[PDB]
Design a protein around this nucleic acid. Structure first.
Ligand SMILES: Nc1ncnc2c1ncn2[C@@H]1O[C@H](COP(=O)(O)OP(=O)(O)O)[C@@H](O)[C@H]1O
Lengths: 31, 93, 107, 442, 97, 78, 95, 78, 107, 91
DNA sequence: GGATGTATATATCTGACACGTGCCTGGAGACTAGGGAGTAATCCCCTTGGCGGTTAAAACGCGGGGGACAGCGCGTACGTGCGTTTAAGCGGTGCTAGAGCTGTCTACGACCAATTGAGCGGCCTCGGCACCGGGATTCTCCA
DNA sequence: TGGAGAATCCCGGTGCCGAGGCCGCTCAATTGGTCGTAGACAGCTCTAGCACCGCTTAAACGCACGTACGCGCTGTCCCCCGCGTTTTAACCGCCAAGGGGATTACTCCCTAGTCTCCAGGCACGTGTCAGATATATACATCC
């Protein structure tokens, strides 16, 4: 039980932080 | 030639509930009509239930959900009981 | 080895075999479960009994030995649950439940 | 009085340093205020320096809000990234699908941020401050700069009614033209600054003595400065009016209208006949150039400037006249760039960089209202205004885009006037209004 | 000499005809009407016997039900007499028009 | 003609079975139009089933099926 | 302003022009979960299922009021009163 | 006690869509009783289909079927 | 040999093959005519056209570019014959036809 | 998962060439067509059964349209039906 | 001499559609089998029609009585508007139940052949019922 | 209350026809076997529904008030009920013609079935453009 649920938070956090950063990179930095 | 009907079976049921009583041909015609009507409805309901679940077979469970949909109130309970009994006896035998 | 009607095999007066035939020829679906006709036959017998019991009572209450349409009509409209099953149904030779509106009665 | 902020990655000039001293004293007194430097003295780096000073002394590392017009947002993103590079700077622009994601930076629970926090300055448009006020109202903004603040001059605007209700401590206005129109608009800026003191339309209304009255009354709330006292190294604007006479086609249409509410229709004829109805029973490009006095007279002037190795900023008030002009520039085989309010906010960055990076480009076509604010165009040298604006502040704002700091050639302003027509009336009124504004500051 | 008061005879009638099963339209004129409607739709149509009996059971069952509904519309309007406006209300609420 | 074969006395009776004490005088002409509009709809369907079967004879079954296409189900004829 | 009654008829010309749902969402939803849990405990609902019930429920009530209105007007009233609901139901066949 | 959550204002708006000018005060308690009886009947059917499919969640489709079981066809949701 | 949709062979924007699949697999009968799906698909296309023609008109009378559920309701309840076909139907987000009894209106 | 969306759009572009059709209104059309298919194929089904016959031909469809559609709508639909089956057979 | 409405611009944004790559599953073509529906010949039943007779009921004509209707007063309910209070609606964070999909394989129902008894048609028949004449009892009505 | 008296029910005797029982027999239901795919099952990903928190602000609520509707009561007068007599056509029992539905045989073409193949349509991206809201400015109008 616990292991899969713990891993879900890390897997979520990674994608959330990257997709957050990608949007700031989308606007501020030239594309 | 050979038109076929449920009059035979209605007589037996009547004999178990009211031993001395009988039944005019017109009343029996009404009973024959009633039985076709209700088979129609319970089969049609069971048909559509199977379709909505994307299933190919009309099992006993479907005929159960259909009784529970068509019949109102206490009728439904008492019928779903007769059904369980019968199928239990068959599965035994 | 000696035959036993599926009906007797399942304690019922209504004909299990014929019901399996009609479920197959009625295009109700492709494959027809075995117990399906047994259960369906049990419910047809139950409803048939329920009406004829009530009709028998109506006949005795009118001093006669044969059920006729008028007794079925009385039986069916005097029970709320059967009436909710058959509200749209007309029974030939049935007549009407006796009901005069109370404001029509004389002063 | 105060030292230069240690985080600041550039040296402040003397008058900028004094400006920071004023603002620091305002903050420590708890008073809100207007930095009203004449355009291109460097309000931006003074503004930024307060965020630096707060982040150093009182360890208030944000959150800080810059609200600015659209043309200008990229400028701020660069300026903060350049002059205080430790600060982490978050755009709040772009599509709704973008902005949702950006809100996921905001910390609603820590009231004062510190260096490790997700973002320190947010930069957003006036337009999004209004549309997304519902979301902004939850924040606890620690310092807030409205740049190009005459955006808020109308007290009846949704914008004023929104920004007045932003929950925040110290506010700074920037506006290089504070005095504008009637005294009701001056009330509006004051109220946005300090609601308790300037609470009434009527009491602010409550003549030479009244003007002397006002000069003292405003002294705790505004710092105004002017180029000639500190930017002595850059020569004054050479301004050259040019007259034009209507073409025969123009003259016909103008008489037709005058015989036949028609204010804006007259302004169109004086720009170019083709802003009414174009041409073809075959229409020649030579007729197109000759058919408008302005364009005809402009063709002389452009050709001279090209031969001399100059580069031109050319302003319009009408968007369809930009469309027409590109055609004539295409035929004369001049390289040009275009920027107006319809231009997507990505392309703004690119275009301004292009004209400041690659001097093959001879002409920048700019809309006056979209072009007038923010953008920095030091590599240009000649400004032309093809049509007069009713409001003198808007043209002022516009020509100061050529006359910044770091300009090294003599800025030349041309202005074309169609004689005997609405154009004259308009420039007449604008100059009256400029005298009034100049008197009230004086 | 004797007359019953207006209404007593009608209530005699309600009891008697609410207690009979019989068909209330005369058979032969009903049968003749059904062929008059049929002969618009297809010419020379032989009718079974039980088909016209079934039409008559349905026809009497429809109208006897319509009078029940009509009567409630009257009584609600504090009348005892049914009138054409009552029938049209009943049909509209039952959705037929 | 035939619709006037449904006599005034007949309607009067039908009404009594529906327990109506006092009947107007304009009811009679309205009731006839109602009954004709009902019969026309049922007969059209019954004749339509009859012609699909390529019979000439309208049976009881055609009528019974016609009525079940109207939410009115008749028991005691097929 | 408006003579006595013109305001009610303005209410009519308002609500017949709009298409919106007329019951408040969250109160409706709570009624549906109250009724459901008699039949089975722990019934999860989909958003779209409660919206379906609400569209159907409002459609049913509105249509009952048209039939109720005709009953009133037939009695030479403009006011709908409980007797009128009960009459419509019995005619329609909802006893 | 959630049925009283259907507010008086709301019953009144529904009436207006149905073209009612003036409403009695007793209408409110009838209308609640009416609405509950209708929802009980549809929800019972929807849950009956849901349990047959061995789901726990009542879906939009269950409800749309439950209404076509009762002659009330709801176009707009699967 | 190049395949030509049954649709094209019968000029029917509606998909005749999909109609034949659903008739065949949906247990309507034991065997299905080759002419069945062509005719039925022609009838669906005709009814689809009728409702959209009336709704299109209602859109342009309201001075709007895009058909919405309000306009389908207004279309369907104006036509005598389509209203008779869809009398039982509720259309989501459709609202009501404007209707006030002349008894309610001002004197 | 399939829908008649595609085809409704094609009919719309042909009858009203400037117009579009909202997502929810398209959902209504997909509901309408499924409904009517079921009604017509159900009546065809029953007609076959009542006549002791094992195929739903095109004649069974035409009698089921004549039963379902009211009045003049029926006439027009049976005309359209007949036209198309003629064209297909002519290939 | 002022407060406001109107008309025309620019500046922006948001959401509807047109097009696009991709991929995949179901529709099209083509080949054979065999059973359903189409053909005609037959046959007996049940419908259409005429006849003469009885008599139930429909058709017509009167009074007179009581109900539908129109009008009026009056009284209490319903609509209104002003002021306050409470929950709905928004938008979030965040957890996890359970819907929806995959891969197995087993067990069950379609399909066949041989059997045989259930249930249909038809024939005989006698007892439940309809109906009739009579008497006793119950409801209306008016003095 | 009291007779009157028309109607209703209950009693009883006749007789008739259809409910009910029993005889052959054919065809469909039962027994025992094969086999092939539906679907019960185990396991998985990840959608999305349930909880719970704070804020604005709209609709929900409460009250004081007044006037319009509902409705109880009366006078009028038409029109329906009740009854009587004449008139007519429905019902009955019957004979007959004959059409048309139900059946038996038999043949052929149509549709299901399997296979090979590829393009229509579904899902997901994206971008671009007309419509909706702000906001600025002049000027005419209403006050
Ligand atoms: N120390 C400095 N180093 C570089 N640029 C500076 C410095 N001080 C001022 N500037 C210039 O100041 C300009 C901003 O002027 P400012 O008045 O703030 O802009 P705006 O008028 O748009 O508000 C920029 O072009 C910037 O390059």
């Amino acid at each position: 039980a616990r292991r899969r649920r713990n891993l879900s938070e890390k897997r979520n956090e990674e994608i959330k932080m990257e997709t957050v950063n990608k949007l700031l990179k989308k606007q501020a930095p030239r594309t | 030639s050979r038109k076929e009907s449920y009059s035979v079976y209605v007589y037996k049921v009547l004999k178990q509930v009211h031993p001395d009583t009988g039944i005019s041909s017109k009343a029996m015609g009404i009973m024959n009509s009633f039985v076709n009507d209700i088979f129609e409805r319970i089969a049609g309901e069971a048909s559509r239930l199977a379709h909505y679940n994307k299933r190919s077979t009309i099992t006993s469970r479907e005929i159960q959900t259909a009784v529970r949909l068509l019949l109102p109130g206490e009728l439904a309970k008492h019928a779903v009981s007769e059904g369980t009994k019968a199928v239990t006896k068959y599965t035994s035998s | 080895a000696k035959a036993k009607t599926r009906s007797s095999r399942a304690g019922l007066q209504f004909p299990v075999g014929r019901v399996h035939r009609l479920l197959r020829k009625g295009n109700y679906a492709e494959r027809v479960g075995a117990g399906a006709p047994v259960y369906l036959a049990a419910v047809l017998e139950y409803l048939t009994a329920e009406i004829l019991e009530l009709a028998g009572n109506a006949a005795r209450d009118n001093k006669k030995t044969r059920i006729i349409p008028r007794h079925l009509q009385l039986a069916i409209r005097n029970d709320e649950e059967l009436n909710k099953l058959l509200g749209k149904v007309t029974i030939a030779q049935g007549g009407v439940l006796p009901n005069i509106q109370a404001v029509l009665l004389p002063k | 009085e105060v030292a230069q902020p240690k985080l600041l990655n550039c040296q402040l000039k003397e008058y900028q340093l004094k400006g920071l001293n004023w603002l620091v004293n305002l903050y420590e007194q708890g008073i809100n205020g207007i930095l009203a430097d004449e355009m291109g003295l460097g309000k931006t780096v003074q503004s930024i320096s307060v965020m630096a000073y707060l982040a150093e002394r009182y360890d208030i590392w944000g959150p800080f809000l810059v609200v600015a017009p659209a043309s200008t947002l990229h400028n701020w993103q660069q300026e903060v990234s350049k002059f205080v590079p430790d600060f982490k700077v978050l755009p709040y622009w772009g599509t709704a699908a973008d902005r949702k994601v950006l809100r996921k930076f905001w910390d609603r629970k820590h009231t004062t941020y510190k260096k490790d926090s997700p973002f320190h300055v947010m930069i957003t448009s006036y337009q999004l401050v209004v549309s997304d006020v519902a979301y902004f109202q939850k924040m606890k903004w620690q310092y807030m700069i409205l740049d190009e603040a005459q955006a808020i001059k109308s007290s009846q605007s949704s914008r004023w009614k929104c920004l007045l209700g932003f929950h925040c401590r110290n506010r700074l206005l920037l506006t290089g033209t504070p005095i504008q129109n009637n005294m009701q608009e001056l009330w509006a800026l004051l109220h946005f600054i300090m609601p308790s003191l300037f609470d009434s339309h009527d009491e602010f209304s409550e003549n030479e003595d009244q003007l002397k009255r006002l000069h003292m009354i405003l002294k705790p709330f505004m710092l105004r400065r002017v180029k000639k006292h500190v930017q002595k190294e850059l020569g004054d604007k050479i301004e050259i009016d040019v007259f034009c006479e209507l073409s025969y086609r123009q003259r016909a249409m103008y008489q037709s209208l005058r015989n036949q509410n028609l204010v804006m229709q007259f302004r169109k004829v004086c720009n170019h006949p083709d802003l009414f109805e174009r041409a073809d029973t075959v229409p020649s490009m030579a007729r197109f150039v000759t058919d408008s006095g302005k364009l005809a007279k402009l063709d002389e002037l452009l050709r001279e400037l090209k031969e001399g190795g100059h580069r031109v900023l050319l302003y319009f008030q009408m968007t369809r006249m930009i469309d027409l002009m590109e055609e004539y520039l295409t035929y004369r085989n001049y390289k040009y760039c275009r920027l107006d309010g319809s231009t997507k906010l990505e392309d703004r960055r690119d275009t301004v960089a292009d004209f400041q990076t690659r001097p093959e480009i001879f002409i920048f076509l700019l809309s006056t209202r979209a072009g007038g604010l923010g953008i920095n165009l030091t590599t240009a040298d000649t400004v032309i205004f093809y049509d007069s604006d009713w409001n003198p502040t808007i043209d002022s704002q516009a020509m100061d885009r050529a006359h910044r700091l770091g300009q090294t050639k003599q800025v030349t302003v041309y202005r074309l006037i169609t004689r005997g027509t609405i154009e004259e009336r308009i420039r007449k009124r604008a100059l009256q209004k400029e005298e009034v504004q100049r008197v009230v500051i004086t | 000499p004797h007359r019953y008061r207006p209404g007593t005879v009608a209530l005699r009638e309600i009891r008697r005809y609410q207690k009979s099963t019989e068909l209330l339209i005369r058979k032969l004129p009903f049968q003749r009407l059904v062929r008059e409607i049929a002969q618009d739709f297809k010419t020379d149509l032989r009718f079974q016997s039980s088909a016209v009996m079934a039409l008559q059971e349905a026809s009497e069952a429809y109208l006897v039900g319509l009078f029940e509904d009509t009567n409630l519309c009257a009584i609600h309007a504090k009348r005892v007499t049914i009138m054409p406006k009552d029938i049209q209300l009943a049909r509209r609420i039952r959705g037929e028009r | 003609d035939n619709i006037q074969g449904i006599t005034k006395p007949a309607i009067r009776r039908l009404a009594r079975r529906g327990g109506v004490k006092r009947i107007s005088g304009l009811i009679y002409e309205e009731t006839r139009g109602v009954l004709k509009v009902f019969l026309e709809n049922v007969i059209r369907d019954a004749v339509t089933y009859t012609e699909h079967a390529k019979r000439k004879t309208v049976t009881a079954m055609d009528v019974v099926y016609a009525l079940k296409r109207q939410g009115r189900t008749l028991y005691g004829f097929g």
